[PDB]
Amino acid sequence: VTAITKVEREAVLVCELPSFDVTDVEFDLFRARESTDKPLDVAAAIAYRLLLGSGLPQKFGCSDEVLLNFILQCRKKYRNVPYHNFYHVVDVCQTIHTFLYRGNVYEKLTELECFVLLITALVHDLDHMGLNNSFYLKTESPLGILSSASGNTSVLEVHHCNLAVEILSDPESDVFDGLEGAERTLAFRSMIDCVLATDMAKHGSALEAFLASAADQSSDEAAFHRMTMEIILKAGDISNVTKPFDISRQWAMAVTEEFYRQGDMEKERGVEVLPMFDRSKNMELAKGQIGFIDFVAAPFFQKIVDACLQGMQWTVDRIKSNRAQWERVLETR
Ligand SMILES: CCCCNC(=O)C#Cc1cc(C2=NN(C3CCCCCC3)C(=O)[C@@H]3CCCC[C@H]23)ccc1OC
Ligand SMILES: [Mg+2]
Numbered sequence: 551v552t553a554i555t556k557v558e559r560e561a562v563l564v565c566e567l568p569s570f571d572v573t574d575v576e577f578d579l580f581r582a583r584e585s586t587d588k589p590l591d592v593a594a595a596i597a598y599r600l601l602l603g604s605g606l607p608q609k610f611g612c613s614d615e616v617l618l619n620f621i622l623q624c625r626k627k628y629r630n631v632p633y634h635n636f637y638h639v640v641d642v643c644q645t646i647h648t649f650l651y652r653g654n655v656y657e658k659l660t661e662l663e664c665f666v667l668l669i670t671a672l673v674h675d676l677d678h679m680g681l682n683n684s685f686y687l688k689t690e691s692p693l694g695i696l697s698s699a700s701g702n703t704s705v706l707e708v709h710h711c712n713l714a715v716e717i718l719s720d721p722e723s724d725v726f727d728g729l730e731g732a733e734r735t736l737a738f739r740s741m742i743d744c745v746l747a748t749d750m751a752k753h754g755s756a757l758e759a760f761l762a763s764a765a766d767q768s769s770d771e772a773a774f775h776r777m778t779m780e781i782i783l784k785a786g787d788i789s790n791v792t793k794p795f796d797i798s799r800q801w802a803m804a805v806t807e808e809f810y811r812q813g814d815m816e817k818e819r820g821v822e823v824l825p826m827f828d829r830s831k832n833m834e835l836a837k838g839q840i841g842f843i844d845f846v847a848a849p850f851f852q853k854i855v856d857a858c859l860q861g862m863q864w865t866v867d868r869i870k871s872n873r874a875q876w877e878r879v880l881e882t883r
C-alpha cells in the first residue's frame with residue numbers, strides 16, 4: 551500500500567458539490583456522478599463531507615488528513631464492475647448516515663459505534679470482482695478452496711475484512727489510531743462482525759437474532775449494540791428499494807447487469823447458471839424488483855421499524871410506493 555499523495559487529496563478537496571445535500575434521504579449519487587467528469591473525486595468528497603459533518607472523526611483523534619488517506623486507500627481497492635464498485639459503498643455510507651441521523655438510530659449506539667458504522671460502509675465490499683460466494687465454490691476456484699479448507703463459507707466477506715485490516719495497519723490511513731485498549735478492540739471487532747454479517751446466506755438468522763434481542767428488555771446491552779450495528783450495515787446494503795423510484799431503478803439496472811455477466815462466465819465455465827443470472831431468460835425488472843420487495847426488503851424493513859427503529863418508517867413508505875409504481879409498469883404493459 552503506497553502512501554496517498556498531496557495531489558490525490560487536492561483532487562478530492564477541490565470538489566464543492568454545489569446544491570447537493572449529502573445528509574438528505576432524497577440525495578442522488580447518480581446526478582452527483584454526472585455533475586462532473588471526475589465522478590470518483592466527487593464520490594470521495596461525498597464520503598469526506600459525510601464523515602466530517604457527523605463530527606465523529608474529530609472526537610476520536612482522526613485528523614482530516616488521515617480520514618482522506620483512508621477514503622482514498624479504500625477507493626483504490628474497488629474495481630470497475632457494474633454494481634459492487636466505489637459508488638455502491640459511498641451509497642451505503644450516505645444511506646447509513648440518514649438511518650443514524652434522520653432515522654434517529656444514533657440514539658441506540660455510542661458515538662464510537664456511529665463512527666465505526668460510517669467507516670465500515672466504505673470497506674464492506676473491498677476488491678469485489680462482480681462474482682458472488684456461490685461462483686467461487688461451484689468453480690472450485692483458489693479463494694473457494696481456501697474458504698472451504700479453513701471452514702468459512704463467507705468467501706468475499708472474509709476477503710473484504712483482510713483488506714480492511716491491511717489499510718488500517720498503516721498509521722497514515724488508520725482512522726482508529728486515536729483509539730487504544732478496549733475502544734480500539736471494539737472498533738476492529740465491530741467493523742469485522744458487521745462485514746461478516748453482510749453475507750446474505752446469514753440474512754434470516756441475523757434478522758431473527760436482532761428481533762429476539764430488541765424484544766428482550768434483559769438482552770445483554772453490548773450484544774444488542776453489536777446486532778444493531780450489523781442490522782444497520784445490512785439495512786444500507788439492501789437500501790436500493792428505499793430510494794426515490796428513478797434512483798432505485800438505476801441501482802436495479804446496475805445489479806442485474808452484474809448478475810448477467812456472472813452467468814456469462816458460469817456459461818463459458820460449464821457450471822450451473824440460475825434464472826436470475828441468465829440474459830437468455832430476459833426477465834422483467836418489474837417482476838424482479840416486486841420479488842425482492844416481497845421476499846427480502848419489505849419484511850426486513852417492516853420488522854426492524856416495528857421492533858425498534860421507529861424513526862426509519864420512511865423506508866417502509868418508499869418500498870410500499872416503489873412496489874405500487876412497478877405494479878403500474880405491469881398494469882400498463
Ligand atoms: C429475488 C429477487 C430477484 C432479483 N432480481 C432483482 O430485480 C434484484 C435485485 C437486487 C439484489 C440484491 C442482492 N441480492 N443478493 C441476494 C438476496 C437474497 C435473495 C436472492 C439471492 C440474492 C445478494 O446477496 C446481494 C449481496 C448483498 C446484498 C444484496 C444483494 C441487491 C439489490 C437488488 O436490487 C437493487
Ligand atoms: Mg458484499
Ligand SMILES: [Zn+2]
Pocket residue numbers: 638642674675748787
Ligand atoms: Zn455491499
